[PDB]
Amino acid sequence: HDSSKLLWATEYIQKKGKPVLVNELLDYLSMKKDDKVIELLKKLDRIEFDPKKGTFKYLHSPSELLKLLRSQVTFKGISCKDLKDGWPQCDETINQLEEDSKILVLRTKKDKTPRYVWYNSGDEEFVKMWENVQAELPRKLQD
Amino acid sequence: DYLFKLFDEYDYWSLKGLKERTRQPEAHLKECLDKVATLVKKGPYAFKYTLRKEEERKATLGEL
């Protein structure tokens, strides 16, 4: 049951609006002085561990999204909100990369105001002209 | 904090058992449990949450 302490401490770091010493946390959070509370802060990406004494602080978006897609080259899907959390206010950058048609975005089939962003592995008249009717002998005649 | 002590006391429990204890709507109980506990929908214990310091968590709850 070590998962809850990190969130009550971090949301407290948001409420206090300033970094809190591990001892100040352990006294305010009334815990035995321990490395695990710091280690959860060393583990958690929403909190910054400071090399000077104790200090714990709470915690380029288009480039970050492009790097995430490149790392994602093995992954065929990602979550929209998680990318936004990694790069705060990345939904707009994701939509812009979409409009550019590179990191392209996929408009929400659930709530039409939302949009998902996806990772890039990198008209019906036009489409039917590009498709029409779709055999082997005309292909050989084509070949 | 009390519900967590139940989770060490019981590896499996229900929103009904929790609502009976906490006298709160199961919907609220289901939200926080998603954070601490996870649900198993298969087996004899199906539809019951299983866990993954407790005193530190209780003091954190008291602070917040």
Next chain:
Amino acid sequence: DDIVKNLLKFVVRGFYGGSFVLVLDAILFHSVLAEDDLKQLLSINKTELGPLIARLRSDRLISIHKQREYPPNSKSVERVYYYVKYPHAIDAIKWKVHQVVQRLKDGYMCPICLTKYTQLEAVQLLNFDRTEFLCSLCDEPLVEKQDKLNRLMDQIQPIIDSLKKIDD
């Protein structure tokens, strides 16, 4: 297979939306997948993967081998092998582009009757008493692009040049 991948990306730009293009690129990243691998790889569901799979089946874009993994643990294993077939895709794209060009290369109607007439019907429908084209049964009055198709054809011309480069 870079040229084939570029032709597939051009086909994704021409045919359908971006999600299908991304699924094709994901298949391109990983060598072989069996029927469940896109679902693990993608955040889309299997039923919706099914509508997309039906759309791919409608065309010649890719190919499916249907194989069972024999080892008798329970019901064994339904593994499907999706491998792109280049010749069928080349033939279908050529037929579509040529048919599109033929369509680009390629009138009278009565309001109440909702009939339709042509030039030969014009010679028949002409009356000497008045000056007009009259309907046959109802005797009602008769009423009733290439450059724009040529510009859209400029988009078709880059694809044709890419196909020529892929051929040689």
